[PDB]
Symmetry: D5
Subunit: 147 residues, 10 copies
């Protein structure tokens, strides 16, 4: 049950993005006891995630890859174009590399820099992190059942 | 056993998704008498269907692959990005392996985890499962009729 | 002074009453304009989602100089259609670039459409137009690709 | 210097899309004086452009391709699904043939077959034609430049 | 040390420029001027993907930057092109393995009024800097993996 | 058993608005044997309906008023503002005057001056006009019942 | 005590609207065993509800008024204008006459005339009817509380 | 030949265009009523200042009909609809009040980015609307008189 | 002394209450129990305007507060009622010349989940506070005039 | 004699709204040789503006009233309902009192409390504040011209 997962996280909204990484690694290492090794990679923005996901996936060292990012409507420029390119990007990379890439690259309906908002997500990203972990494990497992 | 069908269903909303998987398997039997055997593969979320579809398709074991998941606007984050990446992804995967990927990866216009809503889709997926069942039998047939 | 070829008309079983209208119409014009010179072979596919692949499978047989995907992709009020429509409209596009075999789209998505004598009648009738057009488009693009 | 440009135009809304073409041609005529040859290629709809461009692009005959079409919202069926596939498609081709495919496949925000509207674009497509020409000349030279 | 291909659309130069100007500037300041930044002018954003691909493919750049101000013209629908482009780069960078940072911004609103114009003229300087801080960021991070 | 009805119709899209007026004016006669008279008042556009209805209603000669217009989205300027002000306007006038004011001030989801469109509504307003006709006899008679 | 309620309902979609009416009257009885008298009034469509409600409220005979109608997006014309005018009407009327006018004039997000939807709303209206009853007994009570 | 006075209230905003409607308005009326119909202009800050002016003017009884003219565009910075509504509704409210026809040439275009082409188009198109307003002006004034 | 009328819709009571309780809490605080907040329960938001009126007319209240959680249920449109209400209070207050504050909130998103319910249960307290501060401020400001 | 203007500014977003006010007063001060007395009235939110506006308008003390507030999409609850009631309110009021009520109750399209944002509008409200001043004076003037 020993396998490596590459956790790529955007440097943006790190205060929140990290809560997921932390929760993720937590949940993981807390159901694998170090068996599942979570390597962590920092990328500038969500947009730099996919390629990174590919390069890492091609090393063949990871049984799964995790893209973590908080893609928000910055209020100034449109996020969805990237948001799309990134969700598609990963999807493409996993179909290319045959390496599961889970998406914890979330985009909320709303989110204006402010406490009320920030808090909520800083919190909720911990749930996603967990969920991610379970998902990371479940898929890597199910994949083995097949092969 | 004339032919196999991989039914890849997501974990989320299994309460409802299951309703479609159950009616899908049932109909195949009602229509084929067990001639066609359906094999169920569980996966975390809809996002893991494409690759799982790819992987399975490529084994050549199945004459068709069904992807089922209830992808809804999850109150907090946008669902599109994922859904699109999924519906498109399967489309990609079938065009790539020439193995039909039927989609039962539905996205309702509205859905608030409420009694009314839940019971509607719990009831509806049954319908959608019976249709997918028929669709499969058909497209599978139609295709053999081609070569 | 007549050249001939084969067209593969793929149509989704959903809304057949309406879709058929395009098919029947598509076929009728090519009969008027080509008088059998151009043969239209019809393939029934479940949903619009089942078109891109069938089209690719058929286009690769090289028997056809053009594939036609006819489908009435609607917003059923229950689930979102666009995800699939997209996948399909894109899908055919992908196929044609992959097989360099023209795949015309008669896979239409109305802005609004509630089951009803008024709506149904409208498209039932309108698909007859969209079918003729598809014909002239089929002929037009097939001939043009030949010139090359 | 001299090179050839393949101009692919959809037959729909000819009166308008034609304007862009004429402008395109004239501009280049001016800016190159018979040096740059623009080969016109008709195609039924915008959907028919991608593949077409893909086919011409592969001949290596053209230094750049230009898809021209006025894709609007017909008011009956959603257009975008197509516009998307077309705008994405041409991109798909240029990226896979490394042949610049300039886009003059414009999609107005609003456009009911009215006088005002028709006259506006019929007029505006002329401006678009010129830009396309410059964009053409510019992208063609900028490439051969980063190629030396 | 390394080189970066900065492909900028000619449209909305007064603005896009401000982004390039600060990009090159930041890199000089941050790399003591050890990172060569080659500038490439393309007609419009739609022309960027291909140019990124050709340059990227030359294997002369550690990363590529696509800069363009793709706004809603008011006459025609931009998002189509916007998407084609933002996607393209994504496509291209996976294809090439060369990272393509995006400074192809599509503001929510922009009517070329004094207020507006000056606003993005100012912001693109900011955006150009982040681009710089993202380029070095990604290029570094990558090699780190390559060792 | 008899009473008068004020039929206020916008002059825009008479061709379509008319089909309703005619349906209405006939359906009534053909169901009250000319007992009920329908008086037609032309007015420029929908916007000019509310006030007209108020003025007419206040004369107390009509048992009810019917505003009929085709408030389309011209594609140039936004129709909704007027549309809102009008549907609300008639609602306002009918509450003031306590005289029914049926609304055949329809706003289609789409309408581009096209054959298909124009025909569809030309045919529909006929229907909508009959309904309004019944709704009139209904509400009038009904308010009468509640009175006694 | 013995007070009366004016239940105004449109004909359109009676099959569904009625369930609410029935649920309302039934359940209302069940909580009042006939103490509260529910007087039903038929009106063509939602648009004629405000006025009727007004006229009826003014009689002073009712302690509350209920508006029942299913204002759907017919798919052809925009409903919201009316939907609005009507919800605002009842609102206006209740403010103008200080006679509670509860709204069971529901406009669902999606509803394309099919068995799917029909059944759901034919059934759900039964709920909205029960709630409407409670809402009525509640407001009529809480109001008379303020009387003391 | 009948003769009546009309009060044309125009918002000073975008007079570049609104003026075109005013001119063609008076133009037509001249040409169509040989001067028997007097149009009296009233300048007002913004569209929002029309309803009140309309009412003030209406109450005098000197006008058979009032015309509110203004181009209420989407500034691109603040939402214009809130105002557009109050004004279009206000004029409605006022005409209902005074029972003096208040025609609306307070147009709100779908798109408008102070382009040269946009500006030319509307500078051009208002002429039409202005005329159309004149016709309706005579139209309703005459139709009311007959009561 | 002066008293305020708090008209609270019952739907989503759990969430609205916080606003109420919080409102009353802050109000008594900033005014050492000198202000009497009269709570009036009412079915749904739609019933808030008329009540706010019937009360406003009594003369008894210095200001009225409509409180409700107008959500997009996912089945029928809310905006219609929401508007009619938010407009209604606005109207009733111009009629009665009695401040009527709005704590009739319509969240951008709210799907009956634990996260949402939890968030808003909290936020409505923050709102009740602001409601109190406004009530005082405007009740004050109005008297600062006349 | 002398004249005053009632400037009702909402407490929220003072940093920004204040600019509109300061420059509003600044301009009028200039343009009227200081003969205008711009009385400031603070109010919790934009919602409390209408009533204040009416209360103040009735006094007859002011020749014009200005409502100022920065109503935005707070990302949590919807603003538009309130924004509407406000913009409408002021309109309702001035029509009632026949006292010009100018609106500096601006709602921007996007405003995520960021630096670039906060600064933009802080700088902008200065402008709008001046616009409002030139408007206030312009209308007061204009009306002063009407009554002969
Ligand atoms: Na399917
Ligand atoms: Na086609
Ligand atoms: Na181009
Ligand atoms: Na250069
Ligand atoms: Na109610
Ligand atoms: Na008019
Ligand atoms: Na208007």
């Amino acid at each position: 049950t020993s396998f490596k997962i590459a956790f790529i996280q955007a440097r943006w909204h790190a205060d929140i993005v990290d809560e997921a990484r932390k929760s993720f690694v937590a949940e993981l290492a807390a159901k694998t006891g170090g068996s599942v090794e979570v390597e962590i990679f920092d990328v500038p923005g969500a947009y730099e995630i996919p390629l990174h996901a590919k390069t890492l996936a091609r090393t063949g060292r990871y049984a799964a890859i995790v893209g973590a990012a908080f893609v928000i409507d910055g209020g100034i420029y449109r996020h969805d174009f990237v948001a799309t390119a990134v969700i598609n990007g990963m999807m493409q990379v996993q179909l290319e590399t045959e390496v599961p890439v889970l998406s914890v690259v979330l985009t909320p309906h709303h989110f204006h820099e402010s406490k009320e908002h920030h808090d909520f997500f800083h919190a909720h990203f911990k749930v996603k992190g967990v969920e991610a972990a379970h998902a990371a494990l479940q898929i890597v497992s199910e994949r083995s059942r097949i092969a």
